[PDB]
Design a binder for this molecule. Structure first.
Ligand SMILES: C[C@]12CCC(=O)C[C@@H]1CC[C@@H]1[C@@H]2CC[C@]2(C)[C@@H](O)CC[C@@H]12
Length: 245
């Protein structure tokens, strides 16, 4: 099972946010820690992506592009899995030192987005997603958002994305024909549901970056760069998700 061997081998370990839990749960402290966690997780997402089967087949400029458009969906999907496995999904397990309860959901002023993230987390339980399904679904999320004008070499991207869809298909077929088809429908519907959630968070973090000097929220360098250079291409419609349905 070469493909799943690789996905297990490269899956990132635990990342802490560095949050001071003795602080009061203020809007500023909570988002400053979420932003630091994003910066820390971005390092791991880059190293993970570059180690995926076939990823180096992409043009080098397309490699950075797909990471810089897919990161929010990748990290929210992984956080949903962490939450499902660690607290059976009624708190958001952003990190071992940054677990959101309903109070922090409210204080962060992103309660409705947290509710949608919690619903995504719960789907791992409702659908009884296996670790292998999770790993292959998360890899596919890296290949699920691109510029409407295409990448520098779109042909190799389309081929790579095709191959990851095939791997998802194999994972479903190894498990068990009408059940295979039902499962693939369920998993592709689940994958589609990540992008609307990521879009809402992209809108929220963009607005927060613009007003960050007035609400006392710190943005690390890579986050500030990606959210001002790449995220607005998503929000203005220059970069769009690839949906199954
Ligand atoms: C990706 C992160 C951080 C990593 C994670 O586990 C998911 C979580 C989802 C919300 C993001 C957060 C990074 C910082 C953001 C973008 C804040 O600015 C607003 C929403 C936060």
């Amino acid at each position: 099972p070469i493909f799943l061997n690789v996905l297990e081998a490269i899956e990132p370990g635990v990342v802490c946010a560095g949050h001071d839990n003795n602080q009061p749960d203020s809007f500023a402290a909570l988002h400053s820690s979420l932003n630091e966690l994003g910066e820390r997780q971005l390092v791991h997402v880059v190293k993970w992506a570059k180690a995926l089967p076939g990823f180096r087949n992409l043009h080098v400029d397309d490699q950075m592009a797909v990471i810089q458009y897919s990161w929010m969906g990748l990290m929210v999907f992984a956080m949903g899995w962490r939450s499902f496995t660690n607290v059976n999904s009624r708190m958001l397990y952003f990190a071992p030192d940054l677990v959101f309860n309903e109070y922090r959901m409210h204080k962060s002023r992103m309660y409705s987005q947290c509710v949608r993230m919690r619903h995504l987390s719960q789907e791992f339980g409702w659908l009884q997603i296996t670790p292998q399904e999770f790993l292959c679904m998360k890899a596919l999320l890296l290949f699920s958002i691109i510029p409407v004008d295409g990448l520098k070499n779109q042909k190799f991207f389309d081929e790579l994305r095709m191959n990851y869809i095939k791997e998802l298909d194999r994972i479903i077929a190894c498990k068990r024909p009408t059940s295979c088809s039902r499962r693939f429908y369920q998993l592709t519907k689940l994958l589609d549901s990540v992008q609307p959630i990521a879009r809402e968070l992209y809108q929220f973090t963009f607005d927060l970056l613009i007003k960050s000097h007035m609400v006392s929220v710190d943005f690390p360098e890579m986050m500030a760069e990606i959210i001002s250079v790449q995220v607005p291409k998503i929000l203005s419609g220059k970069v769009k998700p690839i949906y199954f349905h």
